[PDB]
Amino acid sequence: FVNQHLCGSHLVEALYLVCGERGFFYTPKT
Amino acid sequence: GIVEQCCTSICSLYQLENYCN
Protein backbone atom coordinates (compact mmCIF):
# COMPACT_ATOMS: atom_id res chain seq x y z
CA PHE A 1 0.00 0.00 0.00
CA VAL A 2 3.22 2.44 0.74
CA ASN A 3 4.82 2.49 -2.71
CA GLN A 4 2.22 4.42 -4.72
CA HIS A 5 0.45 7.79 -5.01
CA LEU A 6 -1.31 8.40 -1.65
CA CYS A 7 -3.63 11.37 -1.54
CA GLY A 8 -6.02 12.81 1.03
CA SER A 9 -7.68 10.25 3.29
CA HIS A 10 -5.59 7.51 1.64
CA LEU A 11 -2.39 9.22 2.88
CA VAL A 12 -3.79 9.70 6.36
CA GLU A 13 -4.70 6.00 6.53
CA ALA A 14 -1.18 4.95 5.42
CA LEU A 15 0.39 7.14 8.13
CA TYR A 16 -2.00 5.62 10.68
CA LEU A 17 -1.05 2.04 9.67
CA VAL A 18 2.71 2.58 9.44
CA CYS A 19 3.23 4.77 12.50
CA GLY A 20 0.98 2.74 14.84
CA GLU A 21 1.24 3.69 18.54
CA ARG A 22 3.74 6.49 17.82
CA GLY A 23 1.10 8.47 15.96
CA PHE A 24 2.05 11.00 13.32
CA PHE A 25 1.71 14.53 12.06
CA TYR A 26 -0.12 15.42 8.82
CA THR A 27 0.92 18.83 7.47
CA PRO A 28 -0.30 19.24 3.88
CA LYS A 29 0.56 23.00 3.80
CA THR A 30 4.28 22.54 4.69
CA GLY B 1 6.46 18.19 2.19
CA ILE B 2 4.31 15.10 2.35
CA VAL B 3 1.88 15.96 -0.45
CA GLU B 4 4.69 16.68 -2.96
CA GLN B 5 6.53 13.51 -1.94
CA CYS B 6 3.64 11.02 -1.45
CA CYS B 7 0.62 12.34 -3.41
CA THR B 8 1.92 14.18 -6.53
CA SER B 9 4.99 11.67 -6.61
CA ILE B 10 5.22 8.05 -5.46
CA CYS B 11 5.51 7.63 -1.69
CA SER B 12 8.02 5.42 0.17
CA LEU B 13 8.17 3.87 3.64
CA TYR B 14 11.34 5.82 4.23
CA GLN B 15 9.42 9.05 3.61
CA LEU B 16 6.24 8.11 5.53
CA GLU B 17 8.26 7.25 8.64
CA ASN B 18 9.68 10.78 8.77
CA TYR B 19 6.14 11.90 9.72
CA CYS B 20 5.76 9.46 12.64
CA ASN B 21 6.18 10.92 16.14
Author numbering:
A (entry chain B): 1 to 30
B (entry chain A): 1 to 21
Paper excerpt:
To demonstrate the versatile applicability of spitrobot-2 we demonstrate reaction initiation and fast delay times in three independent model systems, obtained by single crystal rotation data collection: Streptomyces rubiginosus xylose isomerase (XI), human insulin (HI), and bacteriophage T4 lysozyme (T4L). Using 12 crystal structures of three independent model systems, we demonstrate successful cryo-trapping via observation of conformational changes and ligand binding within 25 ms. Spitrobot-2 is an integrated benchtop solution for cryo-trapping protein crystals with a delay time of less than 25 ms. It is suitable for monitoring ligand binding events as well as conformational changes of main and side chains.
Human insulin (HI) is a 5.8 kDa peptide hormone produced by β-pancreatic cells, which facilitates the absorption of glucose from the blood into tissues. In its active form, HI consists of 51 amino acids divided into two polypeptide chains: A and B (21 and 30 amino acids, respectively). The secondary structure of insulin shows two almost antiparallel α-helices in chain A and a α-helix followed by a turn and a β-strand in chain B47. After a century of crystallographic research, insulin has been identified as one of the most polymorphic proteins, displaying a range of molecular conformations, crystal forms, and binding capacities for metals and ligands. Several cubic insulin crystal structures have been analysed under different conditions, such as crystals in 0.1 M sodium salt solutions with pH values ranging from 7.0 to 10.049 and in 1 M Na2SO4 at pH 5.0 to 11.050. It has previously been reported that cubic insulin crystals undergo a structural transition when the pH is lowered from 9.0 to 5.050, while their crystal packing is not affected. The conformational change of glutamate at position 13 of chain B (GluB13) is accompanied by the binding of sulphate ions close to phenylalanine at position 1 of chain B (PheB1). Here, we aimed to induce this effect by a pH jump with spitrobot-2.
